[PDB]
Write an enzyme that holds these catalytic residues in place. Structure first.
Site, mmCIF file in Angstrom:
data_model
loop_
_atom_site.group_PDB
_atom_site.id
_atom_site.type_symbol
_atom_site.label_atom_id
_atom_site.label_comp_id
_atom_site.label_asym_id
_atom_site.label_seq_id
_atom_site.Cartn_x
_atom_site.Cartn_y
_atom_site.Cartn_z
ATOM 1 N N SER A 154 0.870 -1.183 0.000
ATOM 2 C CA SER A 154 0.000 0.000 0.000
ATOM 3 C C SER A 154 0.898 1.221 0.000
ATOM 4 C CB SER A 154 -0.752 0.132 1.331
ATOM 5 O OG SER A 154 -1.567 -0.973 1.562
ATOM 6 N N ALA A 173 -0.469 -0.240 5.790
ATOM 7 C CA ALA A 173 -0.151 -1.229 6.816
ATOM 8 C C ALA A 173 1.100 -0.906 7.617
ATOM 9 C CB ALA A 173 -0.006 -2.560 6.069
ATOM 10 N N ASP A 186 6.012 -4.848 15.239
ATOM 11 C CA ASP A 186 5.895 -6.117 15.948
ATOM 12 C C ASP A 186 4.987 -5.911 17.176
ATOM 13 O OD1 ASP A 186 6.047 -8.369 17.474
ATOM 14 O OD2 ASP A 186 8.030 -8.907 17.206
ATOM 15 N N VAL A 241 2.854 -8.629 18.180
ATOM 16 C CA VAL A 241 2.402 -9.956 18.530
ATOM 17 C C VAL A 241 3.621 -10.778 18.965
ATOM 18 C CG1 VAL A 241 1.462 -12.120 17.552
ATOM 19 C CG2 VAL A 241 0.459 -10.011 16.876
ATOM 20 N N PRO A 278 12.362 -10.039 20.552
ATOM 21 C CA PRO A 278 11.006 -10.103 20.032
ATOM 22 C C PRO A 278 10.833 -10.918 18.771
ATOM 23 C CG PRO A 278 11.893 -8.012 19.580
ATOM 24 C CD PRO A 278 12.932 -8.688 20.460
ATOM 25 N N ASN A 312 4.991 0.941 2.882
ATOM 26 C CA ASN A 312 5.115 -0.102 3.910
ATOM 27 C C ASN A 312 6.573 -0.299 4.372
ATOM 28 O OD1 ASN A 312 2.653 -2.179 2.215
ATOM 29 N ND2 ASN A 312 2.170 -0.770 3.877
ATOM 30 N N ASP A 332 8.139 -9.492 13.274
ATOM 31 C CA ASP A 332 9.007 -10.646 13.340
ATOM 32 C C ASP A 332 8.864 -11.658 12.206
ATOM 33 O OD1 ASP A 332 6.979 -12.718 14.090
ATOM 34 O OD2 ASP A 332 6.974 -11.695 16.076
HETATM 35 O O1 LIG Z 1 -0.775 -3.145 2.713
HETATM 36 C C1 LIG Z 1 -1.213 -4.234 3.104
HETATM 37 O O2 LIG Z 1 -0.427 -5.162 2.922
HETATM 38 C C2 LIG Z 1 -2.575 -4.482 3.782
HETATM 39 C C3 LIG Z 1 -3.251 -3.194 4.193
HETATM 40 C C4 LIG Z 1 -3.594 -2.275 3.223
HETATM 41 C C5 LIG Z 1 -4.087 -1.065 3.685
HETATM 42 C C6 LIG Z 1 -4.343 -0.866 5.013
HETATM 43 N N1 LIG Z 1 -4.832 0.053 5.330
HETATM 44 O O3 LIG Z 1 -5.115 0.288 6.698
HETATM 45 O O4 LIG Z 1 -5.055 0.878 4.197
HETATM 46 C C7 LIG Z 1 -4.094 -1.799 6.014
HETATM 47 C C8 LIG Z 1 -3.512 -2.971 5.536
HETATM 48 CA CA LIG Z 2 7.136 -10.788 18.121
#
Ligand SMILES: O=C(O)Cc1ccc([N+](=O)[O-])cc1
Ligand SMILES: [Ca+2]
Lengths: 557, 206
Positions: free
Chosen positions: A1, A69, A73, A75, A205, A241, A252
Site C-alpha cells: 500500500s 499497513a 511487531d 504480537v 522479540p 510499507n 518478526d
Molecule cells: O498493505 C497491506 O499489505 C494491507 C493493508 C492495506 C491497507 C491498510 N490500510 O489500513 O489501508 C491496512 C492494511
Molecule cells: Ca514478536
C-alpha cells in the site's frame, strides 16, 4: 500500500495534496465501498473497505486522512508450561492456573457436524502444543481487548478539525497501521499508530518467550513512543510499507525486512525530482510506480561492474547492455500480452540463479526455500497483491554492498569466490535459459507481461460472487486496489477542497434474480485501467447538482 | 424531522446520507450497503465468524475451524457491552438499517433477492451489532494486524545452530533476519527523530 502526502512547501497550485493507494488485492465486487455521511456531527465523503462504519479513506472538508499497513511487531508468542497430570492447567507465577476453554460445532452442508475445543490462557489463544515437551504456544497480541475501540477511533476521527483533535483519536487506534493527515491550511502529518508491548530487558522479540511469569510484558508503551512527524522539513511524507523511523523494529515475520533495498525509494526519487508538484503530477506518480521494475535500480551497478571487461560479442555483456538502455518502466506491446523490453525476464532469471548460488546455499533445508523466490513469481491470473523486492533479494543486496552494509556478514554468501565470478556465472545461466526459448536475437524477444484479475473470491478464498463475475485486465499495475486524491485550497477553483477516487468494478454488486445487472455494476472498470478517476462530492449543492435519485425514509427507534 | 433519513445517490451510484441523530445516520448507511452489497456482506460475515461450511460444505471445514481458533467471541461481546449509548448507536443503527432492507428482500424475493443467493441456495439472515463489529475484526485486526512467525523463526535458529554451532548460528540468524538495519529508508527523516528503544538480539530469554 503506498501513500504520498505533499505539503505547502512542495505543492503547486494548492496548499496540500494527498494520494493514497491501499493494496489489498483485486476483487469483484469491489473491496471498498463509497459513502457520504451528513448529520449528527459528521460531514464526510470517501470510500472504505467492507463498508466499515468509519471511512479509512476520505475527508470532511477541513482535514483528510488515509492509511497504509504498519508492520510493527505487536504480537509475541508465549511458550506455556503444561503438565502431563493436571491437564488444562499451565504454570504461571508459581501456581497451576486453569485455562479458559470453549466448545465449537461446525455445521456442514451435506456433511456431518464437527466439534472441537478452543483453549486460551492469560497470554491468549493457544496456537499449537508440543506434547513431547509439554509446551503450548499462546499468541499474545498487544491490541487484544481493544478491537472495538479501534473501530470507533476510525469513526470518531472523521469529526476532527485539526491535528490535536485527530491525534487524540490516533492514540486510541490499537492495530499496527500508519495514519496520514492533511488539512485546508496545508499542514501534513503522519503517525505510526497502534499498541506496542513494554518488554522486559533481554526479550528478543523475534522468538518465543517462556510463559511462566518472568517474561510477561510490563504493559504497553505510551503513545509518546509511537513514531510520528508533523510538517516535516522535507515537505512531504511517503510510505510503501517501509520503516516509519530510524531504529524502529519491524514485524518478526521471517519474510519481512526493512533494509537498504526498499521500494519506497521509487516514490522518493519522483517526489525529489521536481521542486513543486501539481495535483496532476501527484496523480501521475501512480502511473509511473505502477509500471516500474523494482530490482533494476538495486543490481544494475553490480551487473555493470562485472561485465565491464567483457568483449562486445560476449552474450553476458549484451544482456547487461540491454538493461543499461532501459529505464525499467514496463509497457505492453500492441498484442496486449507481451512486454516491449525483456528486462524483467532477464532480472528474474538472473536473480533466481544468484539466490540459488548464495543465500539458498548457506541455509539448511528446508529453510532454504524461504529465500529462493526472485519476487517475480505469479500465475496466469497474475499477482494477488503488490510486487515487492523479495527477502532473498534484500539479503543479497546487503552482501553485494560489502563493508558499506551495516549488517555483519557472519557467513560469506559468496563462499570465497570474488563476487564478479558469481555474477558472471548467473549471467551465463540467464543467457542459456532465455536464448534457448527465444533465440539469439535479443531485439525480437517478446516476453510475457503480467495481467490483473478482479477475483470472485475474497481474500480468504471464499466466494463472494459467482465465478463468471471475475474480471480480467490486460495490464498488471502495482497500485492500490482503489486510488483517491484530495487537493486542499486549489488556486484553480473556488472550492476549498477537491477530491477524486475510483472504486472498480463499480459501486454496486447487485444482480437481480432475472440476471439483470445493476446500472452501477461495472461503470468504473475502464476508468481504473486507464488511470482515470471520478469526483467525490461533499457539499449539499454539489450532491444536489449531481443527483441521479433520491429515497426518503421515516423511522423511529 | 428527527425520524427522517434522506438518501441521495450520485451519477456513480454513490449514496449520501442525511439524518439528524446517530442512530438514523448509521441506519441509512446500513440500508444502502444492504442494497448494494448484500451477498458480498453476507459471505464476509460468514468468512469472519467461520460459518462458511454451513452453506458451502466440506471443502470449508478446516477454514472454519481455523477462523474460530483465532479469536474469542465473548471478549468481543464484552467490549460491545461496555459502550456508551452514543457509541452503541453507531453499531445498532447500522445493523437495524441492514435489517430493514433484508426484511423487504425476504418479503419480495422474486425481484429483490440478489441472484447469487439463488445460485448458492440460501437466503440472508438478520444482523446484530456483533456481526458489524466482526466485519472489521476479521478483515483488519485478525488478518492485517496479526502477523508473527516466531515459532518458525525458532525452528530456523535451531537449524542454523546445528549447522554452524551455537554462537555462529546466532550471528547468521542475525544476518538473515536482522532486528534493525540502520540503512533502511524511513518515512520520518533522521533529522526529525529516531526511535528510542533498544532491543535484545541474542535470544537472551533462553
Ligand atoms: O498493505 C497491506 O499489505 C494491507 C493493508 C492495506 C491497507 C491498510 N490500510 O489500513 O489501508 C491496512 C492494511
Ligand atoms: Ca514478536
Amino acid at each position: 500500500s503506498n501513500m504520498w502526502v505533499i505539503g505547502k512547501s512542495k505543492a503547486q497550485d494548492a496548499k496540500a495534496i494527498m494520494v493514497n493507494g491501499p493494496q489489498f488485492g483485486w476483487y469483484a465486487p469491489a473491496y471498498t465501498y463509497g459513502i457520504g455521511l451528513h448529520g449528527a456531527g459528521y460531514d464526510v465523503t470517501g470510500n472504505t473497505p467492507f463498508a466499515y462504519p468509519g471511512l479509512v479513506f476520505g475527508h470532511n472538508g477541513v482535514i483528510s486522512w488515509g492509511s497504509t499497513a504498519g508492520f510493527g511487531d505487536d504480537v509475541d508468542i508465549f511458550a506455556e508450561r503444561l503438565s502431563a497430570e493436571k491437564p488444562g492447567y499451565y504454570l504461571h507465577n508459581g501456581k497451576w492456573v486453569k485455562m479458559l476453554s470453549r466448545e465449537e460445532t461446525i455445521t456442514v452442508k451435506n456433511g456431518q457436524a464437527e466439534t472441537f475445543t478452543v483453549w486460551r490462557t492469560v497470554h491468549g489463544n493457544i496456537l499449537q502444543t508440543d506434547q513431547t515437551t509439554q509446551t503450548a504456544y499462546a499468541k499474545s497480541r498487544a491490541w487484544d481487548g481493544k478491537e472495538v475501540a479501534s473501530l470507533l477511533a476510525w469513526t470518531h476521527q472523521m469529526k476532527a478539525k485539526n491535528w490535536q483533535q485527530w491525534t487524540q483519536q490516533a492514540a486510541k487506534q490499537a492495530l499496527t497501521i500508519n495514519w496520514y493527515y492533511a488539512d485546508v491550511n496545508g499542514n501534513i502529518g503522519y503517525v505510526h499508530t497502534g499498541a506496542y508491548p513494554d518488554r522486559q530487558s533481554g526479550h528478543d522479540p523475534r522468538l518465543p518467550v517462556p510463559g511462566t511469569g518472568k517474561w510477561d510484558w510490563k504493559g504497553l508503551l505510551p503513545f509518546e513512543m509511537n513514531p510520528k512527524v508533523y510538517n516535516p522539513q522535507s515537505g512531504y511524507i511517503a510510505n510503501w510499507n517501509n520503516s516509519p523511523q530510524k531504529d524502529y523494529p519491524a514485524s518478526d515475520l521471517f519474510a519481512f525486512l526493512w533494509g537498504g533495498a526498499d521500494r519506497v525509494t521509487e516514490i522518493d526519487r519522483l517526489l525529489e525530482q521536481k521542486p513543486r508538484l501539481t495535483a496532476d503530477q501527484a496523480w501521475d506518480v501512480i502511473r509511473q510506480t505502477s509500471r516500474q521494475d523494482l530490482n533494476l535500480r538495486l543490481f544494475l551497478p553490480t551487473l555493470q561492474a562485472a561485465t565491464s571487461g567483457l568483449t562486445q560479442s560476449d552474450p553476458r555483456r549484451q544482456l547487461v547492455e540491454t538493461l543499461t538502455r532501459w529505464d525499467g518502466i514496463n509497457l505492453l506491446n500492441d498484442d496486449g500480452k507481451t512486454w516491449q523490453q525483456p528486462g524483467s525476464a532477464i532480472l528474474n532469471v538472473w536473480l533466481t540463479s544468484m539466490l540459488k548460488r548464495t543465500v539458498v546455499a548457506a541455509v539448511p533445508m528446508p529453510f532454504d526455500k524461504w529465500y529462493s523466490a526472485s519476487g517475480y513469481e505469479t500465475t496466469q491470473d497474475g499477482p494477488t497483491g503488490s510486487l515487492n523486492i523479495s527477502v532473498g533479494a534484500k539479503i543479497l543486496y546487503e552482501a553485494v554492498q560489502g563493508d558499506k552494509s551495516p549488517i555483519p556478514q557472519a557467513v560469506d554468501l559468496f563462499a570465497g569466490k570474488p563476487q564478479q565470478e558469481v555474477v558472471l556465472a548467473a549471467l551465463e545461466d540467464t543467457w542459456e535459459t532465455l536464448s534457448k526459448r527465444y533465440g539469439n536475437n535479443v531485439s525480437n524477444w517478446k516476453t510475457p507481461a503480467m495481467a490483473l484479475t478482479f477475483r470472485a473470491n475474497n481474500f480468504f478464498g471464499v466466494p463472494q460472487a459467482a465465478a463468471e463475475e471475475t474480471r480480467h485486465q490486460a495490464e498488471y499495475q502495482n497500485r492500490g486496489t482503489e486510488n483517491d486524491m484530495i487537493v486542499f485550497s486549489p488556486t484553480t477553483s473556488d472550492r476549498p477542497v477537491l477530491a477524486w477516487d475510483v472504486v472498480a468494478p463499480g459501486q454496486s454488486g447487485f444482480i437481480a434474480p432475472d440476471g439483470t445487472v445493476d446500472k452501477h455494476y461495472e461503470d468504473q472498470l475502464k476508468m481504473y485501467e486507464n488511470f482515470g478517476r471520478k469526483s467525490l462530492w461533499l457539499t449539499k449543492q454539489d450532491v444536489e447538482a449531481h443527483k441521479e435519485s433520491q429515497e426518503v425514509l421515516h423511522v423511529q427507534r | 424531522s428527527s425520524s427522517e433519513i434522506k438518501i441521495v445517490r450520485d451519477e456513480y451510484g454513490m449514496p449520501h446520507i442525511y439524518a439528524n441523530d446517530t442512530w438514523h445516520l448509521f441506519y441509512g448507511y446500513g440500508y444502502v450497503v444492504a442494497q448494494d452489497r448484500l451477498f458480498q456482506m453476507e459471505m464476509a460475515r460468514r468468512s469472519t465468524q467461520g460459518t462458511v461450511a454451513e452453506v458451502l460444505g466440506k471443502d470449508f471445514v478446516k477454514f472454519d475451524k481455523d477462523i474460530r481458533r483465532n479469536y474469542w467471541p465473548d471478549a468481543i461481546r464484552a467490549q460491545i457491552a461496555a459502550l456508551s449509548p452514543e457509541d452503541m448507536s453507531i453499531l445498532q443503527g447500522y445493523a437495524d438499517g441492514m435489517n430493514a432492507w433484508i426484511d423487504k428482500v425476504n418479503t419480495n424475493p422474486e425481484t429483490l433477492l440478489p441472484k447469487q443467493f439463488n445460485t448458492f441456495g440460501f437466503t440472508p439472515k438478520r444482523w446484530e451489532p456483533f456481526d458489524v463489529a466482526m466485519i472489521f475484526v476479521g478483515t483488519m485486526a485478525n488478518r492485517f494486524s496479526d502477523s508473527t512467525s516466531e515459532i518458525d523463526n525458532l525452528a530456523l535458529l535451531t537449524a542454523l545452530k546445528d549447522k554452524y554451532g551455537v554462537s555462529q548460528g546466532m550471528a547468521v540468524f542475525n544476518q538473515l533476519k536482522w532486528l534493525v538495519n540502520p540503512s533502511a529508508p524511513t518515512t520520518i527523516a533522521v533529522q526529525e527523530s529516531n526511535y528510542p528503544l533498544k532491543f535484545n538480539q541474542q535470544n537472551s530469554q533462553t
